[PDB]
Write a protein that binds this ligand. Structure first.
Ligand SMILES: [Cl-]
Length: 164
């Protein structure tokens, strides 16, 4: 298992525009196009990201290109966030993947309210971190996906994804 299969399981793959769990225009593998309620705004963002006139649909290859660009962006945002970097560096390979997954899910770096969780992670207080991560809108809105990531932080294994 690795970061790409991981998120690939968590995000799914759709080749035609769709609305995420939040009602946002997205496509491919978790690729948020826009937060605007405008389909037109979404197709434009889509054409621009793709480099061609899509008409709202892409090929598998195109989806995977976006995905690669996106995972790369995430890692790099982490490396560049002053609060994320140290956490990320203190972690093992498996837990690092969970951090990437979560940041990817946010579509942004060092999201609001997880200072305490980060601190517990950094100190390797796994069980406590798990519990704390769970007191979050995140967990309540997408409990299944959040449970998988949380289990990954607490254990340092891929157990939560081995069976999907
Ligand atoms: Cl879920």
């Amino acid at each position: 298992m690795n970061i790409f299969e991981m998120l690939r399981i968590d995000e799914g793959l759709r080749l035609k525009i769709y609305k995420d769990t939040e009602g946002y225009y997205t496509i491919g593998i978790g690729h948020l196009l826009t937060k605007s309620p405008s389909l037109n705004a979404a197709k434009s963002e889509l054409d621009k990201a793709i480099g061609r006139n899509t008409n709202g649909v892409i090929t598998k290859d195109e989806a995977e290109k976006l995905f690669n660009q996106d995972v790369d962006a995430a890692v790099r945002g982490i490396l560049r966030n002053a609060k994320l970097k140290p956490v990320y560096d203190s972690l093992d390979a498996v837990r690092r993947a969970a951090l990437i997954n979560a940041v990817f899910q946010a579509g942004e770096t060092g999201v609001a309210g997880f200072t305490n969780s980060l601190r517990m992670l950094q100190q390797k207080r796994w069980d406590e971190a798990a519990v704390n991560l769970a007191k979050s809108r995140w967990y309540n809105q997408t409990p299944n996906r959040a449970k998988r990531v949380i289990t990954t932080f607490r254990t340092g294994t891929w157990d939560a994804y081995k069976n999907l």
